[PDB]
Amino acid sequence: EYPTVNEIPVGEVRLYQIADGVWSHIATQSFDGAVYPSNGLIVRDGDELLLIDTAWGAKNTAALLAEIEKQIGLPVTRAVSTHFHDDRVGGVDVLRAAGVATYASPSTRRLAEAEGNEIPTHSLEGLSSSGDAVRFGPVELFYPGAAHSTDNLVVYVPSANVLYGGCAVHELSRTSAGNVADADLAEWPTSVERIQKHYPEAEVVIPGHGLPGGLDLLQHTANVVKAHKN
Ligand SMILES: [Zn+2]
């Protein structure tokens, strides 16, 4: 009953309750001829919501805040973007308009500025070297070296063990690595390992696109990366 690409008209957003006070958001985008689903996270912050990743574009992101309001009723006050690609930063401006404070690592900020994609206002200190981790309200942000992009963050909800992989973790059903335009394929499976090791207590893994699952996604993701490589 996790929503899939075929049940979401582009422009619309679904919320999926992952755990007490942790939801994923799912939306769809035109990409490479195809239509992709894409995931993010919303996490209760005591009094407010912390948002991980935009809904992939202004419209979606508008649709996203509206859906939150109607289903949760708490105010999104902060947003973290896990990499500089448009499915992560696309709609920052809408979030800013909405009074949301946007964050990304300095690394993501540089890389997104260079590409002319929307740029997260604030900078996260403490993530520049691989294996680093900072606490950001109810989540831990972790920088597992380079995988799908050189700046990809992953996110742990310790009060639920929910691991959000971002675009560096593939869904089981997925057979290829993704857009590999900016990937570090050589480093990527080491980076995935750095995640396995740092988060063994993880009960749910959420991938950048597709159905969630368990720690198997990291392994699945590793094989997948190895396989594209020859
Ligand atoms: Zn990407």
Automatic annotation (TrEMBL):
| Subunit-level organization | Monomer.
The taxonomy runs:
Bacteria, Pseudomonadati, Pseudomonadota, Gammaproteobacteria, Pseudomonadales
Q: Which GO terms describe its cellular component?
A: periplasmic space
Q: Which gene is annotated as encoding this protein in its UniProt record?
A: blaVIM-4
Stated name of the protein = beta-lactamase
Q: Name one GO biological process term.
A: antibiotic catabolic process
| Highest taxon of the lineage | Bacteria
EC main class here is hydrolase
Names of required cofactors: Zn(2+)
Metallo-beta-lactamase domain residues are: 37-209
Q: Which residues bind Zn(2+)?
A: H83, H85, D87, H148
Could you list this entry's UniProt keywords, alphabetically sorted.
Antibiotic resistance, Hydrolase, Metal-binding, Periplasm, Signal, Zinc
What role does this protein play?
Class B beta-lactamase which confers resistance to the beta-lactam antibiotics, including penicillins, cephalosporins and carbapenems. Acts via hydrolysis of the beta-lactam ring. Has penicillin-, cephalosporin- and carbapenem-hydrolyzing activities.
A single GO molecular-function term is: metal ion binding
